[model samples]
Target: ALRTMVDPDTCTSCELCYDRVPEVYKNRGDGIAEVVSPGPDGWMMVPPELEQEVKEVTDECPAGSIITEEV
Candidate 1:
């Protein structure tokens, strides 16, 4: 299972992830970036199709806050 999470504390607000994967990442009202997809707890249940795009931003995040986990 693939899941995604954006560490708000670690997020640098670079906003690249939002640009890189706008559909899956968003700021909502907080300055910190968050996953748009719902998952267990606050994690993001990345849709199978969005995995590539999500992984792209995860690799591109300068803050290294974008996390992709396999459970």
Candidate 2:
């Protein structure tokens, strides 16, 4: 199970991952995104479901810090 890493220093915390797929993203108090489970739940196998949203989050991110890959 792999997960996307959001650099707090660079992440804008736009909440796209949380908004699109709440199962993986959760609020960290200051509006930043943190992995819900931090392991398997963070790893989404269904590309069709997460690809677009992930891309949107990655691209729309003002800091350009969202990055994801295989386990």
Candidate 3:
């Protein structure tokens, strides 16, 4: 399985992920981004479903805090 996560400590308040990929990312009202927690480890499990967009968000995140991993 594939999973996604945002390291809150490294995440900037930028809304790139939240605005561009709401299906998997959210602006946690805490000034950092967070994964929508659709699966294990607070990850969203459908990377293939939105691979292109997900990559876009990951690449565009200025803080480089978005991460996707194979579990």
The candidate with the higher TM-score, 1 or 3, is 1
TM-score of 3: 0.80
Residue 11 lDDT in candidate 3:
90
TM-scores for all candidates?
A: 0.83, 0.60, 0.80
lDDT tens per residue, model 2, 17-64: 677767556676788876565544444343455655666666666766
Winner of 2 and 3 under lDDT: 3
Model 3 agreement with the true structure over 1-71: per-residue lDDT tens digits: 55678889899788888888888888899778888775555667755777678777787889889887666
What order do candidates take by TM-score, descending? 1, 3, 2
Model 3 off-target regions past 4 Å?
38-40
Clashes of 3: 0
Give the least accurate 10-residue stretch of model 1, judged by summed lDDT: 22-31
- RMSDs, each prediction? 1.6, 3.7, 2.0
- Identify the runs in model 1 with alpha carbons over 4 angstroms from their true place: none
State model 2's lDDT: 0.62
lDDT of 1 at 26: 90
lDDT value, candidate 1, whole model: 0.83
Candidate 3 weakest ten by summed lDDT: 38-47
Superposed Cα deviation of residue 36, candidate 1 (Å): 1.3
